[PDB]
Amino acid sequence: IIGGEFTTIENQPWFAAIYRRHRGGSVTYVCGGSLISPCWVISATHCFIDYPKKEDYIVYLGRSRLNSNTQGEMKFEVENLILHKDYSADTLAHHNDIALLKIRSKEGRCAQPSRTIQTISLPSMYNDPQFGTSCEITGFGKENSTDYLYPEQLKMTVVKLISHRECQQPHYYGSEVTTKMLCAADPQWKTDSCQGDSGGPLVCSLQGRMTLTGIVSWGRGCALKDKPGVYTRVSHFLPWIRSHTKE
Numbered sequence: 746i747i748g749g750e751f752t753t754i755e756n757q758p759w760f761a762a763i764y765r766r767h768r769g770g771s772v773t774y775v776c777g778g779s780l781i782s783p784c785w786v787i788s789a790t791h792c793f794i795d796y797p798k799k800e801d802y803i804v805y806l807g808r809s810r811l812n813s814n815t816q817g818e819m820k821f822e823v824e825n826l827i828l829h830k831d832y833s834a835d836t837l838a839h840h841n842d843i844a845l846l847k848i849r850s851k852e853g854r855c856a857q858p859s860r861t862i863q864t865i866s867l868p869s870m871y872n873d874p875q876f877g878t879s880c881e882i883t884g885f886g887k888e889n890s891t892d893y894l895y896p897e898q899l900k901m902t903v904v905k906l907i908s909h910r911e912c913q914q915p916h917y918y919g920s921e922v923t924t925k926m927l928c929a930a931d932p933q934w935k936t937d938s939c940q941g942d943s944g945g946p947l948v949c950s951l952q953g954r955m956t957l958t959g960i961v962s963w964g965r966g967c968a969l970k971d972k973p974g975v976y977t978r979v980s981h982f983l984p985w986i987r988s989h990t991k992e
């Protein structure tokens with residue numbers, strides 16, 4: 746997160762931190778996610794497309810720091826990794842950038858809601874917040890595009906939901922942005938999500954309730970003027986989410 750401020754997991758109890766085991770004995774932070782049900786976490790497919798092996802991932806709930814410990818946190822293994830079939834990437838954009846992860850601890854149990862761990866509500870079938878609404882975003886991502894290290898403390902910030910009319914126009918992006926995407930940015934272009942924030946939640950007020958409106962997906966740079974962040978439009982994927990979280 747460029748700009749914004751440092752906070753704790755209590756401000757975003759639904760935030761899941763995803764880690765991966767690499768070749769050579771190293772473990773690194775990959776992306777963020779959101780707890781939609783006690784056993785289900787939603788993220789972006791591009792976070793796993795290059796390394797589709799579910800046994801190499803580790804999920805943390807209730808974690809406010811990247812390395813040091815936070816009391817009340819819970820470690821989880823990935824029982825099932827579901828990537829969207831129609832996923833495809835260009836040099837311009839990611840498409841159908843959404844993924845589901847079924848988590849389970851060592852005892853085979855799911856998440857236990859606490860003051861630091863809670864699920865986020867999903868939007869209603871084709872019912873998004875009105876454009877111009879203030880939404881929150883979180884993650885352990887970069888504070889500057891140029892940085893090589895991710896911050897140690899969780900960050901969050903606020904951005905404005907932008908209409909497709911605006912985002913789809915050439916003064917911003919173009920044809921690459923579809924109705925399955927949502928754009929949001931800071932009208933002053935000082936705060937935004939960045940590398941390391943992918944898979945994270947874009948939370949907005951829907952029916953006077955905090956709702957998962959989008960998933961951090963892509964953008965040209967980070968906090969670049971006239972280049973808004975692009976999120977996966979969760980509401981346009983409800984049938985998909987429901988059919989995969991059945992039995």
Ligand SMILES: *C(=O)[C@H](CCCNC(=N)N)NC(=O)CN1C(=O)[C@@H](NS(=O)(=O)Cc2ccccc2)N=C(c2ccccc2)c2ccccc21
Nearest residue numbers: 836837838839938939940941943962963964965966967974
């Ligand atoms: C998390 O993984 C990031 C979150 C970005 C949010 N950015 C923002 N709010 N302004 N997602 C990616 O980095 C995915 N990308 C890119 O977004 C890409 N932007 S792009 O090249 O201008 C157009 C594009 C290309 C390919 C896929 C999607 C969009 N930038 C990348 C990048 C650039 C420099 C350093 C690291 C990463 C990039 C590179 C490879 C694949 C995807 C992405």
